[PDB]
Amino acid sequence: RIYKITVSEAGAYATNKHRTGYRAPIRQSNYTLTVPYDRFLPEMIRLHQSGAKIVNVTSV
Amino acid sequence: SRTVITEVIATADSQGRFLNSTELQAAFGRFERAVPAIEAARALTKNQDALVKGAVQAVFKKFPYVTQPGEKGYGDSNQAKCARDIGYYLRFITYSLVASGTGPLDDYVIAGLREVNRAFNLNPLWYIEALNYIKGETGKLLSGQSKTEALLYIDHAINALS
Amino acid sequence: SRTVITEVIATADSQGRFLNSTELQAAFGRFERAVPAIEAARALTKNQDALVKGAVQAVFKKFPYVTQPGEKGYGDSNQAKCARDIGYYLRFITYSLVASGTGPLDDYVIAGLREVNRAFNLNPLWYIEALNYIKGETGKLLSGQSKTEALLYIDHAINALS
Amino acid sequence: SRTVITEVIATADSQGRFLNSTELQAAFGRFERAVPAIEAARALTKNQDALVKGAVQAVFKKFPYVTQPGEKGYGDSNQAKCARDIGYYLRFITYSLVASGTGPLDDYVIAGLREVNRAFNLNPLWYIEALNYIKGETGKLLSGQSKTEALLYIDHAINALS
Amino acid sequence: FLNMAKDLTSVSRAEWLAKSYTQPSRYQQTETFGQERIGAVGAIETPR
Amino acid sequence: LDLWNTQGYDAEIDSYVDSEEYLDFFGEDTVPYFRGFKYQTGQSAEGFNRLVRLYDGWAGSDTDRNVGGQVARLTANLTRGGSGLEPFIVMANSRR
Amino acid sequence: MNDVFTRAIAQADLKGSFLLESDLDKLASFAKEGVKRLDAVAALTNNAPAIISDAAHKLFAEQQELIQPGGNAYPHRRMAACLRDMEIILRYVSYALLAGDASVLDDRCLNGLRETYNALGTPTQSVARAVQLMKDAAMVHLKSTANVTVGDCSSLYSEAATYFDKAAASIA
Amino acid sequence: MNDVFTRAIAQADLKGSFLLESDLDKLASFAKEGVKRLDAVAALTNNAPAIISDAAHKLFAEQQELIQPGGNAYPHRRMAACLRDMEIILRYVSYALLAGDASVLDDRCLNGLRETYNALGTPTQSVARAVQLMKDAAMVHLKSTANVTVGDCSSLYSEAATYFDKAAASIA
Amino acid sequence: MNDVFTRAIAQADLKGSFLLESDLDKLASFAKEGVKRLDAVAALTNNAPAIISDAAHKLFAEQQELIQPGGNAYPHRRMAACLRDMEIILRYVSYALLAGDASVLDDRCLNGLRETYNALGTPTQSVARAVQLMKDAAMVHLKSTANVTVGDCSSLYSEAATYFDKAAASIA
Amino acid sequence: MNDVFTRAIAQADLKGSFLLESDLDKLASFAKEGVKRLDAVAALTNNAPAIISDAAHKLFAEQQELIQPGGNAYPHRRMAACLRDMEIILRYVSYALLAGDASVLDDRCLNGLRETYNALGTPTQSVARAVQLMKDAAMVHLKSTANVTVGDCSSLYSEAATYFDKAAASIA
Amino acid sequence: MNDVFTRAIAQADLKGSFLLESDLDKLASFAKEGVKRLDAVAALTNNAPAIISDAAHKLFAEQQELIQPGGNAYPHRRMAACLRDMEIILRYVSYALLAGDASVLDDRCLNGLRETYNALGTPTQSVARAVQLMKDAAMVHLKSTANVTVGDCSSLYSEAATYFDKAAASIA
Ligand SMILES: CCC1=C(C)/C(=C/C2=NC(=C\c3[nH]c(/C=C4\NC(=O)[C@H](C)[C@H]4CC)c(C)c3CCC(=O)O)/C(CCC(=O)O)=C2C)NC1=O
Ligand SMILES: CCC1=C(C)/C(=C/C2=NC(=C\c3[nH]c(/C=C4\NC(=O)[C@H](C)[C@H]4CC)c(C)c3CCC(=O)O)/C(CCC(=O)O)=C2C)NC1=O
Ligand SMILES: CCC1=C(C)/C(=C/C2=NC(=C\c3[nH]c(/C=C4\NC(=O)[C@H](C)[C@H]4CC)c(C)c3CCC(=O)O)/C(CCC(=O)O)=C2C)NC1=O
Ligand SMILES: CCC1=C(C)/C(=C/C2=NC(=C\c3[nH]c(/C=C4\NC(=O)[C@H](C)[C@H]4CC)c(C)c3CCC(=O)O)/C(CCC(=O)O)=C2C)NC1=O
Ligand SMILES: CCC1=C(C)/C(=C/C2=NC(=C\c3[nH]c(/C=C4\NC(=O)[C@H](C)[C@H]4CC)c(C)c3CCC(=O)O)/C(CCC(=O)O)=C2C)NC1=O
Ligand SMILES: CCC1=C(C)/C(=C/C2=NC(=C\c3[nH]c(/C=C4\NC(=O)[C@H](C)[C@H]4CC)c(C)c3CCC(=O)O)/C(CCC(=O)O)=C2C)NC1=O
Ligand SMILES: CCC1=C(C)/C(=C/C2=NC(=C\c3[nH]c(/C=C4\NC(=O)[C@H](C)[C@H]4CC)c(C)c3CCC(=O)O)/C(CCC(=O)O)=C2C)NC1=O
Ligand SMILES: CCC1=C(C)/C(=C/C2=NC(=C\c3[nH]c(/C=C4\NC(=O)[C@H](C)[C@H]4CC)c(C)c3CCC(=O)O)/C(CCC(=O)O)=C2C)NC1=O
Ligand SMILES: CCC1=C(C)/C(=C/C2=NC(=C\c3[nH]c(/C=C4\NC(=O)[C@H](C)[C@H]4CC)c(C)c3CCC(=O)O)/C(CCC(=O)O)=C2C)NC1=O
Ligand SMILES: CCC1=C(C)/C(=C/C2=NC(=C\c3[nH]c(/C=C4\NC(=O)[C@H](C)[C@H]4CC)c(C)c3CCC(=O)O)/C(CCC(=O)O)=C2C)NC1=O
Ligand SMILES: CCC1=C(C)/C(=C/C2=NC(=C\c3[nH]c(/C=C4\NC(=O)[C@H](C)[C@H]4CC)c(C)c3CCC(=O)O)/C(CCC(=O)O)=C2C)NC1=O
């Protein structure tokens, strides 16, 4: 199915951006992305690697 | 901060695979080399006040002009900030020695160094000359591989500030 | 091939930075423990004959159902290129020892292993039995750090075959 | 370079459409302000030598510690390069005034400014002082609006340096 | 040689060096030279 | 090629779009643009040249309606690693 | 991309020189006659569909082979692409008329266009013919003195003519 | 996500002080145990397929409802997802064991792992039981003294058990 | 990307044979002077800004044509690009010094660099001069006896000279 | 994204009727005094780093806890982020001033900033204090009667104060 | 892409005419024979692994140099690529058999394959030989009468052979 992942960044993403430098224009922290089941795992791993914080996931 | 063990784990998780022979390689090297690094950390910690005062006076030496009235080094608050900043740099050097990786250095001074110094009109050459002072001091204060461990981190700090 | 040197140069290049202290420390570790690895490589190269013959015989003992007619192990040519394959595995394991990284194994054997074995209907358990035997007499032939270094690569090849 | 007309055309082109009322009104504003800007450039061109000499002298007055032996401000070559730099800045300020956009500055001076100044250890504060001088004498050289445009461009340069 | 001598000695070295530094280069290259050569001025100056 | 062969076309597109390169430079909100006209870290010094070869100008397209078809441009350069004339450039930069 | 002012600045930078009094006078004159330039640009922009329709009708009357089966404008796709090309060329010519420099044309409009047409098989003589027809259609709207203060604007007519010619010359 | 040394640096900077001598002594003790720790993590990474396979055999022997049609380990697709999830959990356990820190586990998967399993409806108690079986197999392979010099490692088994427990308790 | 070990393996595999006894001896020797090789690589990395700055000063003294209005390194942007290239080439030289082979240098830095400069209109002779000046400023810091054990490294100096000269001959 | 004219047009369209003569007079007045608006925006822009530096010095003199280790602006990068946020707020305030409408500030900079700071752990009240300090420095710089012909611009001062106060209120 | 119908339509469009009665008759015959075409395509698809394995065995018995160290199918990786390429070519041949047209084979599979193999160092003669062995195995399976209703399908045999040898001709 499709799952909505609400993402937050509380500093791990912040320090990664501080090291690498702002490299695409800055954006707000809390945001939500819809992901299908096929792309569910890679998107999850990608968020975890980036230092992103996921506050909740909803199935619809 | 991104250190040797941490970089191992991050590389392994990036590729979605385990810890292989090379990653165990790096981990063993770090674990065996910790001892010179931590003794260097102890030596730098015990001699912190002498080092920071020497570096502060070195900055006032190679930059005599900063001290006159109307300049940035004049005032007790400004020189206290000088001492505190040199102590910060020394503390993060010791942290990087303990961690066996410049991660503490990068994340606590390097990231955001240039634009902060631009904003507050702090000349990086002051801190470069101070850190060269600590470099020369520890070249004498340390013996063996610990000297190399301290001096490599000091030179990384120089390369960042330069 | 990706070795310690190749890995550190790749990670330095991707970030566009000079080789820092941690990479130099890893390189020093590789250079220091080359000597046990090259000793292991010399031991395995010298003993390759009895090694490969024993491994083939171990495969036949563990899979006696392969030598009968109508099956893979039947024939003299099939025997000869069984031995050829085990010699390949041994040679690339020695390459891995010398290079202080599993890069030769990945690149030459592991990359494309499963689809080749599926196309020609080669049981990976045949080769796991051969490498388990080789693992057995590595202890007989090797000692100290040398033995563990060879065991790492043999286990890596078995894991990939798994 | 990034001027009023070029930005207008770039926005129209990026959206793949002709020039409408908004864009023509912007170009109209550019064509009106051309008069004060062009004759401010004329006045700045006329007094270029005095302005450059005064800016260099102001730098030395504010930074007396550069001119004694051993550092950047010492030597005929260094002082000639100082005159050349201040003339560069003035030239591109007049260019920007004529072109009615910070395109000349942004493209020739500001782009790469910090990396270059860092590499050659040129303090941006020297040029900030020189441009503040230039601002002081353009205050009295120019009247009405021309003063306004020349100040906008001088301050854009200053802001980029700081 | 008299002209070369006058330029060398008569005047100060400072303005001599200043005018030598601003002499037009023999490479007559604008800033966009090089991007006009590979034809990528537009592909670079497009707004992000 | 292996990715498309083993997992199809969609996975091949997802590799490009889920790549760390894409997210570093474009990241979910900016349109892609031509980066390779400036030095990129990890570039191979032939990437600039390969992009100049791939780029056809502002009025150029990548159409499949060109007379010969839609044909590859970088195969020999990619496989060889370069023009193959560099050793001879080194020889020339010696005596003659 | 450059306008007239940036072209002058670029030429002066090759000399390491400030802008001369004469060149500043030329730029001031360009600016003072900018309202006429704006009216010419508005004439090209506002009458663009008329210009393109006139040029298309004349082009396909002169060259019937472009709209037969096998022609370069036969199916709806090829004709749509042809009309898009004409619109694009007129759009960039108006950009150049506003800027005062043919730089926008050479940097963007005509950058890889001859090679594009050559690889496609488009008869570039016919494209240049369409561009000339557009020039003819655009001169009548540029010269129209209705609803605008009457004055001397022959220079703008000549400049627009030369931009259309530069497009056509780059094509063919 | 940070190592034991980086953790100690973290508290040291939060209080702003240089690293204390006792904390330095603890870090030196850890770096002394480091070689034992590398043997342990090498055991974990080396025997991973056997660990997963044994844990799976036992888990689907003790719970057939996952195997039956309509179960959550049915069909091949779900069974492969189960095996992959055990793989990922063991990978993170080895990562934490090498790092010596437990938050490198919670900030990697366990933060969203429970919410994911609640969305998919996977019984978290089954995943916890799978991780516990993996723990048993990991202790069995860890305590093996063949081809490695003999010595006590009680701290390492305790730490590995705590990490397995943290995974199985954060999922459930 | 090849070092000496992988290059030896590649040759041995084209032959289809194990590494010979003399090959193992050469590789053991390489690993033996690996410490001095690391000293040289650290000398190049720690002193990069000084090497680049010295090379730039001498280069722009010699060829002042490069930095006058119109020169290829004249505006701030192109001068910064110049310094960036110098740092890149020095970085790849240091990589080649670490690996013991120039394969990384040639493959990732030099194979297309000259035609890049030609495409942009950059004088390749001046780039080669800059690389030579970098070699000069790097030998002085490379031989610095302070801070390291005194010993013999003439072979390393020759190897680094070959890397720098190959860069200069490739670019020119 | 609106300005005064677009907002007025929006209300006129919701009522479904033409703009009234009172509205036309109001907007004609707005455009007549837009010269003062340009002066105010130029004053805000030309002195932006001075405003930010002054406000930072004041804020870090008053709120000393941020600077100290463990404070929100202690790690040297967090100071960089503080400065970046202050500059962003100033930039959007100047945008809104030029527009005459506060919607551009809100919809693009302030709508999520509260949740961002709360997720981060930043003290929002100190951010509001920084915004007010920026308001004070900006008022000092706009009221500078030099460099411009003297005139009554109390409306501009009030408008800028409203934008700063509204930004502070939305932040905290 | 083209099938037989779409080519016919394409030439008819080039003339600008309808499809003549003879062309419609040929297409009717094609569609009548379509069920035999489907049987041929399913024979190619169903027995594909057998075809690839037989071709590989024959090819590597014939050319043992390919599987010796230094051969172009020596390491596992090159052997996997070899088998992958054979599968890909057979798959595009099955596509062309179903379509009745060799267009997809040319456009996709053989677009630039000879230059690819020349740059890789791949012997194009051996690739063509592999295509011939695949053709032989395919004819063995396609002539099979088991599980199909007996009938004359020689046109399909000859057409399949033309696709195979066209691939082999383009490669070598
Ligand atoms: C639309 C424009 C926009 C804004 C304005 C914005 C604010 C913003 N501020 C941030 C961090 C921050 N912001 C601040 C600044 C505050 N804390 C200090 O106490 C100061 C008093 C005060 C500044 C006035 C600090 C210190 C951080 C770092 C937080 C951390 O790393 O822990 C971050 C997270 C950085 C990242 O994820 O890489 C954002 C997104 N984001 C946007 O997209
Ligand atoms: C944890 C890492 C870290 C660093 C390195 C750091 C540097 C730093 N030093 C500062 C103050 C300062 N630091 C100095 C240092 C000068 N005094 C003179 O005697 C010398 C020439 C020179 C030192 C060598 C001065 C003059 C100031 C006052 C800046 C001002 O004008 O407000 C400030 C402004 C914020 C504040 O202290 O209130 C920063 C950001 N801050 C950090 O959080
Ligand atoms: C890079 C290193 C490398 C490896 C490891 C490798 C394995 C390998 N062995 C092969 C032959 C083979 N090898 C075997 C293996 C033996 N036969 C029996 O006596 C034993 C039970 C069994 C081993 C324990 C068999 C059964 C074949 C038959 C394939 C065929 O008939 O085509 C083949 C097919 C090529 C050929 O026809 O010779 C490959 C790819 N090839 C490589 O290039
Ligand atoms: C058009 C764009 C542009 C600008 C603006 C520019 C400035 C510039 N001036 C330079 C030299 C210099 N410029 C100065 C300036 C100093 N002289 C002292 O009297 C003062 C304290 C101070 C001036 C206020 C100095 C000392 C150098 C020599 C630095 C060195 O070689 O170590 C350099 C280094 C390269 C060279 O030596 O030519 C640059 C890039 N270059 C450009 O291409
Ligand atoms: C990884 C290996 C690698 C290298 C080294 C490399 C160099 C490189 N240099 C470039 C431009 C340049 N390079 C230079 C440097 C030269 N001109 C100066 O006069 C000097 C004589 C000389 C340096 C010593 C200059 C001035 C430019 C700007 C050219 C232009 O765009 O006009 C560019 C074009 C993109 C850009 O402007 O950033 C590349 C890709 N690329 C690579 O992939
Ligand atoms: C909103 C977009 C916009 C437009 C369109 C615009 C055009 C414009 N045309 C003007 C008059 C004029 N317009 C023209 C041009 C005409 N003369 C000939 O009849 C030609 C057919 C034609 C030009 C090709 C001339 C000659 C003047 C008189 C001004 C002069 O001669 O200097 C004026 C000044 C009014 C005055 O005479 O005092 C403007 C502002 N301005 C704008 O902001
Ligand atoms: C990025 C961090 C991460 C998370 C959050 C994670 C959990 C996780 N488990 C998943 C599915 C699954 N997970 C399981 C787990 C099995 N079910 C029970 O029977 C077993 C006891 C248990 C073994 C642990 C199953 C059966 C599915 C398939 C769910 C379905 O499709 O119905 C998925 C979705 C897979 C996809 O859509 O591609 C995720 C993300 N793995 C990770 O690497
Ligand atoms: C390159 C990868 C690598 C390997 C192969 C490795 C094995 C290894 N084990 C060692 C000692 C040891 N290793 C262990 C651990 C074992 N004790 C029990 O048998 C357990 C089953 C097991 C751990 C769970 C112990 C107890 C020692 C002796 C104590 C000590 O020397 O510190 C040593 C130190 C001997 C020396 O080099 O001088 C090595 C290198 N270490 C590595 O970094
Ligand atoms: C942190 C990473 C790291 C580095 C950087 C490192 C370098 C390093 N090289 C060493 C030996 C040495 N180093 C050198 C190199 C110097 N001799 C010449 O004067 C040259 C000027 C110069 C090199 C070009 C030499 C010749 C030796 C002695 C060789 C030997 O040990 O037999 C030593 C001391 C070991 C000893 O002599 O007992 C160190 C620490 N080791 C490390 O773990
Ligand atoms: C290129 C950018 C640009 C700017 C900056 C600009 C400002 C500008 N300010 C002007 C005078 C003025 N400027 C101001 C500004 C006020 N004076 C008070 O001291 C306040 C402190 C200050 C508010 C910030 C005032 C009130 C006038 C006179 C208004 C009038 O003419 O009635 C004028 C008309 C002068 C004339 O032609 O007679 C302009 C065009 N125009 C531009 O095209
Ligand atoms: C789901 C996929 C699908 C397939 C596979 C399919 C095949 C198919 N084959 C058929 C008969 C046939 N099939 C063949 C072809 C075979 N005869 C010879 O042995 C040749 C070796 C060989 C050709 C390669 C022939 C000759 C007929 C008799 C009908 C006719 O000749 O028109 C028929 C007509 C009904 C029948 O007689 O059984 C169908 C529908 N249709 C489908 O929808």
Residue numbers in the entry:
A (entry chain Z): 17 to 76
B (entry chain N), C (entry chain O), D (entry chain S): 2 to 163
E (entry chain 3): 291 to 338
F (entry chain 3): 436 to 531
G (entry chain Y), H (entry chain U), I (entry chain W), J (entry chain T), K (entry chain X): 1 to 172
Text taken from the publication that reported this structure:
Phycobilisomes (PBS) are antenna megacomplexes that transfer energy to photosystems II and I in thylakoids. Here we show the cryo-EM structure at a global resolution of 2.9 Å of the 5.9-MDa PBS from Anthocerotibacter panamensis (hereafter A. panamensis), a recently discovered Gloeobacterial species that diverged from Gloeobacter spp. around 1.4 billion years ago. The A. panamensis PBS features a configuration comprising two herein characterized linkers and presents a paddle-shaped morphology. The two-fold symmetric PBS contains twelve APC hexamers assembled as a heptacylindrical core surrounded by twelve PC hexamers, with approximate dimensions of 273 Å (width), 500 Å (height), and 129 Å (thickness).
The top and bottom AP cylinders also use different linkers to connect to PC hexamers. For the bottom pentacylindrical portion of the core, two common CpcG linkers tether the Rb and Rb’ PC hexamers to the A/A’ cylinders, whereas, at the top, an unusual combination of CpcJ and CpcN is used. Two CpcJ linkers connect four side PC hexamers (Rs1/Rs2 and Rs1’/Rs2’) to the D/D’ cylinders via the inter-domain linker. Although previous studies proposed CpcJ as a linker in Gv742128–30, our study is the first to demonstrate its function structurally. The bilins at Rt1’I (CpcN) and Rs2’I (CpcJ) have longer bilin distances to the core (36.0 Å and 35.9 Å). In contrast, bilins at Rs1’I (CpcJ) and Rb’I (CpcG) have shorter distances to the core (27.6 Å and 25.1 Å). The CpcG-mediated PC hexamers Rb’I show the shortest bilin distance to the core, suggesting the highest energy transfer efficiency. The differential bilin distances from PC hexamers to the core generated by the three linkers could be a selection target to eliminate the less-efficient CpcN and CpcJ linkers during the evolution to crown Cyanobacteria.
